[PDB]
Design a protein around this ligand. Structure first.
Ligand SMILES: [Cl-]
Ligand SMILES: [Cl-]
Ligand SMILES: [Zn+2]
Ligand SMILES: [Zn+2]
Lengths: 284, 284
């Protein structure tokens, strides 16, 4: 027969990693569908319950052809295979509470889940409970710098001059209106964060697909606040949506933004990093 | 200086491929931002106009760090580099008409665009005008098999028995209600097709993200109608959405579906390929 043993992996993050050991206890080799083993392809391979109630699978479903030889993993007589999966990225484990997880069938393992923490926030692209929690934390920080930016623009200034260049009331109203909409998106709109991107840069968006922001490797290496920070990256990204500010990416980096501000204030007003650096205001 | 020459590539499809030659006409080497050359990363590098009116860029915008040495392509004195891009996947070229394209700046090239052709259809993931047209064609065919499936379920049967097993009125009503919703999605809902997937299988969906269907390699190799066809793949995929039929992927392939129908009609009623094969009805 085929036995499935599941063990929780102990770790210091909020992720939920499990080790699954499949063992062929019989005397003849058996063939296992690779699709039915944890992997790079989403599959609903677990029963996950919070407090006795199943929670949702959040991954994709895939149409595949009938399997051929290529699609099987062979397990010899007596032989075991162990694979590790992170479960929080694939099921709805966002709410605090006592969870069980069973492969499905294995024994159930159980654990406590801390809880990741108008407007709403959704996730896709296998964000783990760590990433979800970090993203919400980064959003609260973005809210802080975006509120600050708005308050500044409403009062009456080197901060403005730095990022947006020579004063004109039309450009200053334009900047204030852009920050007003960014603050409204953070405060009141349905945001989506996606964690599937493995690229070396910070994030990307489609300006016609509000309000979904795709984080990449540099987001995770960035500090939560400060220059080129997780908070500022969310301000940058939001500013691109057609329904927010419609900014472009005309240049990257503080040095470039200060140049654009000096040489062509209209382009600076249309640049995402310029908006980011105005809100990050680091150094102050 | 740096000259940019753009040439249209002649081909027999509806795609819009262009060759861009950048030449360093100066006497010292120059460094070109790789981001500003066509590539795997979306960038808005072209001005595209239909009948004199710019059309929308549809790709992503990316937050990147300031460039370092790594981020440049070097072009020696006198030296040329040529790169090819497909423009239709990245701009809105869906409408019939006379277009110009200029890299931006290059000369403009011009051409005629045939036009790809309640409910609406959107695209993402760099679908070319060929793929868009093929997808719409496949949708009309899906509509045909889905209408047929609905008509069959409303009359009064080996077709039903094959895919859904022993008759009971509750299961037959359930099947009819699932096909009713699939036909309603095709007819009346905002569908999105995405072409970014390079996996060897047919397609995938997130059941909580209606009505976006991601096509992969086997979709493109499939015939438009018949067994495991582009039309049937759209019926399969649609059936998964929580707001359509909420089906699972419990088994793949006609042989498996006929088994499920024979052994556990309730699971057959919950299986996407079973719905697909009922509508494809091939052989009839
Ligand atoms: Cl699917
Ligand atoms: Cl971005
Ligand atoms: Zn499926
Ligand atoms: Zn950007």
């Amino acid at each position: 027969g085929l036995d499935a043993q599941l063990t929780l992996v102990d770790g210091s993050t909020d992720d939920v990693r499990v080790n699954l050991t499949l063992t062929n206890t019989g005397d003849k080799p058996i063939r296992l569908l690779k699709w039915q083993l944890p992997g790079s392809d989403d599959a609903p391979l677990f029963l996950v319950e919070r407090d006795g109630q199943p929670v949702s699978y959040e991954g994709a479903l895939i149409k595949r052809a009938a399997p051929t030889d290529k699609d099987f993993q062979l397990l010899k007589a007596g032989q075991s295979l162990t694979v590790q999966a992170e479960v929080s990225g694939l099921y709805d484990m966002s709410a605090q509470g006592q969870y069980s997880i069973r492969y499905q069938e294995s024994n159930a393992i159980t654990l406590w889940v801390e809880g990741v923490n108008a407007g709403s926030v959704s996730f896709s692209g296998r964000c783990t409970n760590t990433q979800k929690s970090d993203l919400l934390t980064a959003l609260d920080a973005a809210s802080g710098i975006s509120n600050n930016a708005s308050s500044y623009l409403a009062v009456d200034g080197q901060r403005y001059r730095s990022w947006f260049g020579a004063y004109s009331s039309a450009r200053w109203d334009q900047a204030e209106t852009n920050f007003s909409k960014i603050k409204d998106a953070i405060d009141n709109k349905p945001l989506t964060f996606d964690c599937s991107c493995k690229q070396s840069y910070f994030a990307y968006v489609y300006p016609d697909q509000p309000y979904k922001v795709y984080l990449c490797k540099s987001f995770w290496t960035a500090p939560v606040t400060g220059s080129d920070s997780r908070a500022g990256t969310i301000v940058h990204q939001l500013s691109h949506f057609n329904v927010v500010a419609g900014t472009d990416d005309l240049g990257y980096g503080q040095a470039n933004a200060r140049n654009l501000a000096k040489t062509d204030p209209v382009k600076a007003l249309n640049n995402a990093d310029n908006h980011e650096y105005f809100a990050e205001n680091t150094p102050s």
